């Protein structure tokens, strides 16, 4: 199946790798719940014209809280301690670790995260429906092809890499469209608003690039390096969690700050 089950069925996990991963994943969903309350409670601070962004952030928080909670429970319940060896091994009586929860989260959140910026910034020469459709089509194809490649993570590294490269092509199209959105959105707003948009662009670029980084984490030191191990599992789930918080919560906070700044003439 996946790299997590592979390690869990062969080498097992140290108490530390199992506990660290349970805690990071728990922090992930905990932050989404806090984010949910923040976006609901702050909806009254922005003008009505911009409230769709707060609404879409709130919906992303529900998606991410529920699905990361389900992933967290799946992690903790999938491995059981062996006293002889002193490690956690995959439990054949369990469901086994499943990355489906995260990929479904991506399928839901990606279209809403890309769409929500179009309720805060104004385009100039691009059409709203064109940009929206390109975001949605490429976003969906990114996640779908990456999901396909994930099936080959352990069994066929070649297909894993090829499908990931196909997915990356759609990713680069998204980055290209978003860069245009940001540049049109900077036209005729105040310098304070332009500086927030510049920050949004940088946050977007870095935080979205973390996802492919985590997808490749166990192979980033070769076919038998330091990360082809429980340490690469830990690193993968840490980087996902940093990306989750950044791409969903911080991105949303910054858009709301942009909407407040735009209310000032
Ligand atoms: C909260 C969720 C978000 C922002 C999810 C974003 C997911 C991606 C940017 C996925 C990207 C991928 C690649 C560009 C190549 C490797 C396969 C993916 C699906 C991880
Ligand atoms: C510009 C407004 C000031 C920024 C406030 C950001 C608040 C984000 C709320 C969610 C973060 C919760 C983190 C702790 C959970 C554990
Ligand atoms: C307008 C008040 C802001 C409330 C902060 C959001 C609550 C985070 C919970 C942790
Ligand atoms: C449309 C926003 C809500 C999306 C929720 C997705 C379904 C949650 C399933 C959690 C259990 C699996
Ligand atoms: C069309 C493929 C998009 C990715 C969806 C992944 C669906 C996973 C469903 C979770 C199953 C939990 C058991
Ligand atoms: C307005 C938001 C429309 C896209 C949300 C659903 C994303 C695809 C879920 C499958
Ligand atoms: C300059 C305004 C702040 C931009 C960065 C905010 C998020 C930093 C990481 C937390
Ligand atoms: C599009 C491929 C991007 C791979 C870059 C890896 C950076 C990840 C940081 C961990
Ligand atoms: C914009 C948020 C800051 C990104 C920090 C990148 C963390 C990389 C962790 C690497 C672990 C190996
Ligand atoms: C004018 C721009 C100001 C942007 C402030 C951005 C800072 C957001 C702070 C929320 C981050 C919460 C992360 C908690 C993880 C533990």
Numbering used by the authors: 8 to 272
Article sentences:
Here, we describe a multi-reservoir, high viscosity extruder as a step towards automation of sample delivery at XFELs. After commissioning the device with lysozyme crystals, we collected time-resolved data using crystals of a membrane-bound, light-driven sodium pump. In two commissioning beamtimes at the SwissFEL Alvra endstation, we validated the general performance of the multi-reservoir extruder and determined 13 structures overall.
Second, we utilise the device in a time-resolved serial femtosecond crystallography (TR-SFX) experiment by collecting structural snapshots of the light-driven sodium pump Krokinobacter eikastus rhodopsin 2 (KR2).
